[PDB]
């Protein structure tokens, strides 16, 4: 087991990930990220070649979604079913209608006796953490109000690593440059991915209108993670209020929603980007990326959404398997 | 592989052709495709009635998206997927606006088709099913939309008719099927679709309705065109009646429609439309002995509960056949390949 | 071959009889059927606790119809079907009127039973479950209705009790089980059902409640009838208290219920000091204030193990009804 040049003791890394809950991207260390990226890649090649994907039969999951996040739940359902496991769904409720005046702690204590594991999406931060205390079974956070959404960060990173596999090397001479564009204050997907990218030799352009810029505590985390690996310089983090400057010499453009224009991506705005630049967007989009860009080979936001299948399959496999691993 | 012992079906050849086909409209199904669907449906009927292994399509994952309540049809599709041995993730109890939370139909289907092998889609918007078909990298089966397209209802209607009157398939000038369509023929879109499919064959139509609620001109033109193309059109091909006793005379099939009170000016005008076209053992005495009664269901007042005991009634077998026809269609479309030995027998 | 500590079970014979049986009411389950359910539940308990293969009923497709929210009970049934290796399609987030949309219960179940092997049905209407049973060509398991029939709740309550007090099965005059039912005994239908089942055995009942909320007369009569039939009825068979101190004295089981104000009957470590060493605490759940969170630590509490046993009991019942094996060799046997 290799990613061209890093040997993965997938056995050793699984013994450690077995029955781990994944709430925040900080719950995933370097070795765990390598295992997730290696395994995701195998599910990518197995599904693209129409091979048997059933590496985790015999599990029964509960999926609890206490806000509409139909794309994210469908992605998790598809991953569970494609692995050959089974799922029981709780949807089209909110927190108050589901906890009909019963405690979160009682609910998860009981529900964890029925299933092998739980996919949980709830806009309350409090609730996911109470669920983790009370559950006898691993929980995968599918998203909460504090902007923790680890499978989104993991599929974002997997997507970037497919075009720029040198992000993993921590080589001083091989730096990745990313522009984050739009609502960086409220775009929590940016906060999570920034935290993960700063573990590596990465340089950040935060492109926003003053009012909606990256929060100070996220810039502190980036600075801390860059200093720890001796990749911090005065050039590590730049701030722009316009695309022309922001999109210059960046390998990745990561677009977000801007609710309430200067931050609209078009084929025109993409002319003075590198030949190799790739465009991510966690989706859904509104106006932020013009439909014309879909034809531009730099666009990968739809491949990005697709990779979420492979990354969620990988993570379920590595956590819930009771080991013959996926290969080729 | 034969049907009626007349027509040999190259199920391999026909599968290679149907593989990953979307089915939106009954015109997406040709003669050979219909024969393959009828043959395969029949095998699933005999396999399930004899409690044998039904698992002819195991390794597939479907998404079922129903953006209006159509619980019988959704359950029928779920059951077909699950009985074949495949798996399904469901979207129900949403409408168009709550599901497309201001995201484009194009974007939504582009993403969702990366997660699954196939999509079952029901949406009252016709626009939406067509956009879904353009954007989806995977086959779509229309489970029903606003323009009255509902091809699996047409297919199970036809399968049901062909079980009692297998000569509809022969296109023989001397072996004509006579069907009476009864009730709200303006709004009974199930009639429009089945008419279109029956007119491909040697068939004669009684449209039994009252004034306001007759079969639309565009459907009559389609029937006329399809009958002329197979040299089965005469002055007798299409008759119109405003009452049962004339309408039900010398017809092999009676197809009753839903009559929703929602469709009149008041509850008055609705109750005098029921009564006029309500089916009873009395109204059925001067029908042929071989007459069979279909109804797409639900039945409310259109057919009296006493008729359920009448051996002419098949509307419950009809609903049941939807399982076997949806299993057949999924098998033929979503098998990754076919071998001689792998088809239902 | 199949033994229940010391009772030999002809699981083949009992299955040939239970095959395609509907289970609406706890009285649809006789002595032999209860022994089979307890034996089979126990196997699923040991198989799942040891992460062994649980797939003793693959190849089945169920419909689960829940025409009121009862999310815990629906999840429990879904989990049981999926763990057995079968498949289920769901009808939820509907009520009676939105699902029937003025089509008959009889037509709906006639059609739906052509699609599936079996139906799990929860509906507040009692009329509806009975019409569903007439119309369905396939077995129905009642998951709950308004007349308080909920047989899998009675069965998992009983399974839980039998795990700590296996002598309830012996019908031995010298080995009597004493249970206190606490709270809203008028409206706590789970009490009515369990009482009916426990009274088939050598059992003594403390009904602890106020005045407005006492056990109804007709349930006391059923208990008296079932106790008299097995020569276990005395003037001491049924006692009535309005306070915990007296109610909880010398009882092997405390079964708590919801007391919804539309104070006095709250279980704490203090109220549990004058119970037997061996007493176990059940509660069908959910709880509100009836049991203080401190009691969860008290080894006498088993209400969470109780809810867990619902998985193993619902797996057992689905297996025993819907299995189409022949061989004695194919039954669970840990
Ligand atoms: N209805 C928005 C949407 C898009 C994609 C998916 Cl997978 C699900 C829902
Ligand atoms: N009523 C909230 C709840 C739902 C499911 C389960 Cl299993 C437990 C409690
Ligand atoms: Na499902």
Author numbering:
A (entry chain A): 39 to 298, 312 to 374, 379 to 383
B (entry chain B): 38 to 382
C (entry chain C): 38 to 299, 312 to 383
Task: Reproduce passages from the article.
Aspartate transcarbamoylase (ATC) catalyzes the second step of de novo pyrimidine synthesis, combining l-aspartate (l-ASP) and carbamoyl phosphate (CP) to form carbamoyl-aspartate (CP-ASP) and phosphate. Aspartate transcarbamoylase (ATC) has been suggested to be a promising target for antimalarial drug development. In depth structural analysis of the ATC catalytic cycle has been performed previously, which indicated that ATC exists in a low substrate affinity “T” state and a high substrate affinity “R” state. Here, we describe a series of small-molecule inhibitors of P. falciparum ATC with low nanomolar binding affinities that selectively bind to a previously unreported allosteric pocket, thereby inhibiting ATC activation.
